[PDB]
Design a protein around this ligand. Structure first.
Ligand SMILES: O=C(Nc1cncc2ccccc12)[C@@H]1CCNc2ccc(Cl)cc21
Ligand SMILES: O=C(Nc1cncc2ccccc12)[C@@H]1CCNc2ccc(Cl)cc21
Lengths: 304, 304
């Protein structure tokens, strides 16, 4: 028993982290096979970031201008290309530590682990979610760009995120491994509206099922609701509307606990309308939404 | 900016995890050099755990009865010995992935990362603290025994915890890597009193400094207090008494923000007496205590 915000073991990703320097800028890159992936803003100075023409800036750069270091050894760059907001640096050596991998573009509300890196060296690993407004609430300092988000399925690492920037609001924006930003964000130092950050309803319900499984049951009530009645409450509290697809994904948790999804919705409705009254659920005084239904099942079953 | 419950990158520890089987019991072990460390209760059945005589049970076991598997390869056991509540299995092969390591017995209130494992395979990594009552609030299922807690300083892994048991209360007890339990716990299935779980005051203050650094400032007030006045409040709220040693450890954070330690104590005093009034600090609706002052500095400076 016990429920923690658990991240995937980061070893497979640590073996892919490299340092990329271009001119006076240094950030992290991801070395898989003979390609190093990194944010294209490695070619920029702070002066350039106000309004950069990436194509014009990249023309002034050659393979020898991209310094790629894996630990204490230098990689030889034999090709460079820009794909959306990422640079792909072809090197002459395949990473001997390349795990089985995929590049995936996750959905808002899905979770992933982040391996925060500086100068190609990992500092820590934490779990987070892609918010409905396509930002992530991470922990990144200057130099963390190029740090990646990922999920692991047995031996296969699915890379879903590459860190690019911090918005003036203190939240984070980045791209998938094809260089496309999640959300409307651009790699420019300009005013960028994140959008309303709603609560991921299906994840709160999954975490409520995790609470019951691990003994926290005080919030269970004698009520039920309907999807339309529950959604009127979810609208009022800036929660995502719950759909039958979400009900279906909560099926296994509903089966494990014997608590119908709509009965758990009535518990959540009452918690939204009445608050926690100073009580906690799984060591939290607020409703947690960065655990998907898959995460709760995985953690409660011990998948390695 | 941003503040997360960050764990150390687990790669160095993943390379040490092995599966240990004895009779019908399977748990995890830690392979460093030519020794595999695991909980001594690997020699027990469920029948034995009610009142085991470890010395008498171990006499019936030989080197060939301890099955040690590293991935898909079998390790040859050439020696076995019991040190406190851990077994040390000498194998004929040094772990080629052994990192620089130390065995350390941490203090209550200190934090560490846990790599939860099942059948010698890692499932996840999370950060936690040794509670003042010497329990840890982890996430462990049956088969997780032998999973380890650790800290990393540049290239050196300091192993501080090995998981042994779950108390009927749902909290966790374990040993240092010399096999000595943290707290009064014994490796027996019996009624065990955890003790009052107090809040780690120095860690709450460090997290309050982390909040100010990352922009959350609403809780700052026009007041100050003294150590003795603050401690009267800390006593009432089951908080650890704050000492001048704790004030001294908060020195760098106090210097960084320009907020005197006793002024931050007055902010904490007011939060204890008045609550959060529905507000949050660093995404939390309660006072967080599993970030040491060293952790806040490390995360806010980007140490790799
Ligand atoms: O945001 C960026 N980097 C960071 C990333 N994360 C956390 C940071 C914390 C503190 C300083 C920098 C941080 C960079 C720096 C310049 N401005 C800028 C503008 C657009 C783009 Cl694409 C990248 C950047
Ligand atoms: O506690 C133990 N293991 C576990 C460890 N962690 C989380 C568990 C969750 C669910 C079932 C088992 C779990 C073992 C099992 C038997 N009882 C027992 C008694 C004493 C000692 Cl030293 C070990 C044990």
């Amino acid at each position: 028993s016990g429920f923690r915000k658990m991240a995937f073991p980061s070893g497979k990703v640590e073996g892919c982290m490299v340092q990329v320097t271009c001119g006076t800028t240094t950030l992290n890159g991801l070395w898989l096979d003979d390609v190093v992936y990194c944010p294209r803003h490695v070619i920029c100075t702070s002066e350039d970031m106000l309004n950069p023409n990436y194509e014009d800036l990249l023309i002034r750069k050659s393979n020898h201008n991209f310094l790629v270091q894996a630990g204490n050894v230098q990689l030889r760059v034999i090709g460079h290309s820009m794909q959306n907001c990422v640079l792909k640096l072809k090197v002459d050596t395949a990473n001997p530590k390349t795990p089985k991998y995929k590049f995936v573009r996750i959905q808002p509300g899905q979770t992933f682990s982040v391996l925060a890196c500086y100068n190609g060296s990992p500092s820590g690993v934490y779990q987070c979610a892609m918010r409905p407004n396509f930002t992530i609430k991470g922990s990144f300092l200057n130099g963390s760009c190029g740090s990646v988000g990922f999920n692991i399925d047995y031996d296969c690492v699915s890379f879903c995120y590459m860190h690019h920037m911090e918005l003036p609001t203190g939240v984070h924006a980045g791209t998938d491994l094809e260089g496309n930003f999640y959300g409307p964000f651009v790699d420019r130092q300009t005013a960028q509206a994140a959008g309303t950050d709603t609560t991921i309803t299906v994840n709160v319900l999954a975490w409520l099922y995790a609470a019951v499984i691990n003994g926290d049951r005080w919030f269970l009530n004698r009520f039920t609701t309907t999807l339309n009645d529950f959604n009127l409450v979810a609208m009022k509290y800036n929660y995502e509307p719950l759909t039958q697809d979400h009900v279906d994904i909560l099926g296994p948790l509903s089966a494990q606990t014997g608590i119908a999804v709509l009965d758990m919705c009535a518990s959540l409705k009452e918690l939204l309308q009445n608050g926690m009254n100073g009580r906690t659920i799984l060591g939290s005084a607020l409703l947690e939404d960065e655990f998907t239904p898959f995460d709760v099942v995985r953690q409660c079953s011990g998948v390695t």
